[PDB]
Structure 1
């Protein structure tokens, strides 16, 4: 008789561990434990969401005839940790085998690997069939090509899945439609609202418990709208197909002060805990393309994010090992500035995106990359500090998908290891791709003076102090040509003004 453990990001009735259990003999185990709610200061909505999806997933299995042992975060004898809770079940149920799908973070794998030695019982750790690449396939694909790019990997995934494939060639005779393409942003009022799901009896009781036990944690619980059931996630899926998919590629890089969502799917939360399955999400997009419902560039652009980037980040996470988090190519040591936790700044773009994060635990891609992520980079923040923030604040964050986005893509803390170019940009970009500057106190056209946006001076300071590590980068080559053309006292004034702002952040970091 078997003890099946299921982790909080594995809430799927065909997870690897349920393959061939005996509903009479065996016992599924789920547990809310303090070790996983507290290894980082998660956003309140993140904890509430995960807890509520677990309690709902527990009810799901029970209705399907499974023996389910559930341990609540506040239960009397809660042991506090996976190891502890599995121990309590072993004296309780005395199984002859523990079954578990492989976890999604290094830390958790560490604990899972200590099970067998610590309990003297067979532990069967199963590989996670939700992912198209095993660790073994990806390692071997990476070996025999000393340069890693998503594009060459994504090519393989299209072949392997047959998604958007005419047997042997890609639909429309291009793997990529990057893009068909761009163009400025519009506050389209004739745009449907993204779905919201009002909290039920379970979710309300978890909302109350989270506010009682994690009172000093990041984020507001008000306006909880996440789907916590499988049915509601599949409704979030079909609403995106029906209402937003056909404009996905059009508005992809745009930011609107008044539109936190535009045309994105808002599914990462569900895909990443098993409520939605990645390959089914992709097939629905493709099914919609063949029924005329969206253009080729929106669908391929959308599938590219899932079977391309998300699958590739996972691969990069395990390939790089646990100390990838120590990557600090630029040798930064500055603390994460204070307003990342308060939203209280006069940089209108930083204030909007951080306020959105506070209140919804969501911000879409270009926001994570070019607002908060770009500022961190230019300001020279310790990448470990940035990594903690991104893992804590967003309700779709687990280390495997967060860490390579932060270290590799955003902060370039690994010197371009995962193939991307560096995303440093001045306030010229933000003015082009948003309306944030319109109501901002600074001017995105000024570099010096009391009301220049600090992204401008910080942009050039960042190129100037790291010139040695970046001069050979055929992407910054034009900026450096622009730098050298500036008179000497101008380059001096820009770097002094960069320092004045840098000083103002360090002064604040000291008061705490």
Structure 2
């Protein structure tokens, strides 16, 4: 007999751990355990989504003739951790070996590495076939290459998969090329019970549970993918970086949550976009861009995470110590852009790429926040957030706390960028055209202060040469007044964070 452990982000009937299962003899284990629901203060909607999808996935496996041992969060006898439930199901089932698909967190991986010793039974940890590249392949692609960039990896993924390839050439001669309501799925009985249970057990957690609309079945997630292809995929590249106060979704797909937990397969999503391309329903730039986000960025981020090692989380290139601002938890800031995106995050457990990078992340970058505080908040607030995908985006891409290890440039931008790409300023109490004075957008002074105080470390970064040139053309008193303006704003933040 076999004990097949399946984690909350492994909700696919093709997950590796299921290869070679004897439906008559083996038992699948799913457990809602407190260790996983509390290692960070997850968004209420995140906990609700995961538990619901784990429950529906349990029912689905039972529906496919699998034997499933489920453990709910408020079940008594619940041992509170993966290992504990592993003990219970062992004693229970006296199985011949444990089978599990490798996880997406160093924390969980390490626990699971402890199984073979803890139980004195052979543990079979299987490589997660949901990723195009294994750890060894990513290591070997990166080995020797004195600079990591997503692009090169992406091209190797394009060749590997055959997506948008005309044999050995990229479709359209080049690898690279840079509204209706979104679907809502009404909570069924299971989901409503979960929502109630979560609100009961995690009432102080970040976020609201009101208007939960997530797909929690494979079918509904496939319906969200289909709705994306039909309604938004055609305009996906045309608005990738735009923000709108009245529209939190725009042409984004909102599929990450399903992809990241096994309700959708990344490769199938790409094939959907490609199929749409050939049938004429989307331009090549939008479909290439879309796919590049999945077999490029997503795959590359996972590779970076496992390559950098667990202490990657400690990266602090600029040696920041400042605590996270209080308004990331409350959204009560006069900065309209930050108030909108944070409020959306509180309400919806979602924000699109450019929001995470250029509003809340950009702010945290310019403000010199302890990178670890930033990683923590990103991992908690979004229902697509797991350390393998969140951490490289935060440490590497947004915060540059790894010093550019993953090839990106510093994404520091002023109120000029945000005014240019959004309509948040239109109703903000701050003036983004003003950099000094009490009405000045905080991002202007903060942008220059960031560049100034980190000048030694960013001196030789070609991308910032124009800004430094401009810095150097300002009178000394202008540079002084800007830095002081920044310091006064940071003061206000540090003061607010003292009440703690």
Is the TM-score greater than 0.5? yes
| Structure 1 residue 504, shift from structure 2 partner | 0.1
Q: Structure 1, residues 58-92: CA drift from partner, whole Å, max 9, x if none?
A: 00011111110000000010000000001001111
What is the rounded CA distance, in whole Å, between the counterparts of 1:405 and 1:119 in structure 2? 36
What is the rounded CA distance, in whole Å, between the counterparts of 1:480 and 1:67 in structure 2? 64
What is the rounded CA distance, in whole Å, between the counterparts of 1:298 and 1:96 in structure 2? 50
Question: Which residue of 1 is the match for residue 396 of structure 2?
Answer: 408
What is the rounded CA distance, in whole Å, between the counterparts of 2:116 and 2:407 in structure 1? 38
Task: Work out whether 1:218 is the aligned partner of 2:215.
Answer: no
What is the rounded CA distance, in whole Å, between the counterparts of 1:376 and 1:460 in structure 2? 14
Q: CA RMSD in A?
A: 0.4
| Structure 1 residue 378, shift from structure 2 partner | 0.3
Q: Structure 1, residues 94-134: CA drift from partner, whole Å, max 9, x if none?
A: 00100000000000000000000010001000000000000
Q: Structure 1, residues 452-475: CA drift from partner, whole Å, max 9, x if none?
A: 000000000001101000110101
Alignment of 1:15-414 (within 5 A): 15-178=15-178, 192-414=180-402
What is the rounded CA distance, in whole Å, between the counterparts of 2:445 and 2:146 in structure 1? 36
Q: Structure 1, residues 37-72: CA drift from partner, whole Å, max 9, x if none?
A: 000000000000000000000000111111100000
Ranges in structure 1 where 5+ consecutive residues have no aligned partner: 179-191
| Structure 1 residue 289, shift from structure 2 partner | 0.3
Q: Structure 1, residues 118-153: CA drift from partner, whole Å, max 9, x if none?
A: 100010000000000000100011002111110000
SS at 2:293 equivalent: helix
What is the rounded CA distance, in whole Å, between the counterparts of 1:490 and 1:125 in structure 2? 60
What is the rounded CA distance, in whole Å, between the counterparts of 1:413 and 1:439 in structure 2? 32
Q: Structure 1, residues 477-510: CA drift from partner, whole Å, max 9, x if none?
A: 0100000100111111001100110000000010
SS at 1:68 equivalent: strand
Task: Work out whether 1:470 is the aligned partner of 2:458.
Answer: yes
What is the rounded CA distance, in whole Å, between the counterparts of 1:127 and 1:477 in structure 2? 44
Q: Structure 1, residues 184-243: CA drift from partner, whole Å, max 9, x if none?
A: xxxxxxxx1000000000000000000000010000000000000000000000000000
SS at 1:288 equivalent: helix
| Structure 1 residue 324, shift from structure 2 partner | 0.3
Q: Structure 1, residues 323-363: CA drift from partner, whole Å, max 9, x if none?
A: 00000000000000000000000000000000000000000
| Structure 1 residue 36, shift from structure 2 partner | 0.0
What is the rounded CA distance, in whole Å, between the counterparts of 2:310 and 2:144 in structure 1? 23
SS at 1:415 equivalent: coil
What is the rounded CA distance, in whole Å, between the counterparts of 2:363 and 2:313 in structure 1? 19
What is the rounded CA distance, in whole Å, between the counterparts of 2:484 and 2:104 in structure 1? 44
What is the rounded CA distance, in whole Å, between the counterparts of 1:141 and 1:496 in structure 2? 46
What is the rounded CA distance, in whole Å, between the counterparts of 1:146 and 1:8 in structure 2? 36
What is the rounded CA distance, in whole Å, between the counterparts of 2:62 and 2:381 in structure 1? 32
Question: Which residue of 2 is the match for residue 189 of structure 1?
Answer: none
Q: Structure 1, residues 405-455: CA drift from partner, whole Å, max 9, x if none?
A: 000000000100000000000000000000000000110010111100000
What is the rounded CA distance, in whole Å, between the counterparts of 1:225 and 1:25 in structure 2? 37
| Structure 1 residue 165, shift from structure 2 partner | 0.4
What is the rounded CA distance, in whole Å, between the counterparts of 2:235 and 2:258 in structure 1? 21
SS at 1:100 equivalent: strand
SS at 1:98 equivalent: strand
SS at 1:250 equivalent: helix
| Structure 1 residue 3, shift from structure 2 partner | 0.5
What is the rounded CA distance, in whole Å, between the counterparts of 1:6 and 1:137 in structure 2? 25
What is the rounded CA distance, in whole Å, between the counterparts of 1:284 and 1:89 in structure 2? 39
Ranges in structure 2 where 5+ consecutive residues have no aligned partner: none
Q: Which runs of 4+ in 1 moved over 3 A?
A: none
SS at 1:20 equivalent: coil
SS at 1:99 equivalent: strand
What is the rounded CA distance, in whole Å, between the counterparts of 1:403 and 1:84 in structure 2? 27
What is the rounded CA distance, in whole Å, between the counterparts of 1:298 and 1:91 in structure 2? 53
What is the rounded CA distance, in whole Å, between the counterparts of 1:29 and 1:57 in structure 2? 11
Q: Structure 1, residues 345-398: CA drift from partner, whole Å, max 9, x if none?
A: 000000000000000000000000000000001000000000000000000000
Query: Under a length normalisation based on structure 1, what TM-score does the superposition of the two structures give?
Result: 0.97
SS at 2:462 equivalent: coil
SS at 2:118 equivalent: helix
What is the rounded CA distance, in whole Å, between the counterparts of 2:168 and 2:449 in structure 1? 48
| Structure 1 residue 28, shift from structure 2 partner | 0.3
What is the rounded CA distance, in whole Å, between the counterparts of 1:307 and 1:397 in structure 2? 18
What is the rounded CA distance, in whole Å, between the counterparts of 2:472 and 2:255 in structure 1? 45
What is the rounded CA distance, in whole Å, between the counterparts of 1:497 and 1:282 in structure 2? 47
Q: Structure 1, residues 258-299: CA drift from partner, whole Å, max 9, x if none?
A: 000000000000000000000000000000000000000000
Aligned length: 499
SS at 1:370 equivalent: helix
What is the rounded CA distance, in whole Å, between the counterparts of 1:473 and 1:14 in structure 2? 45
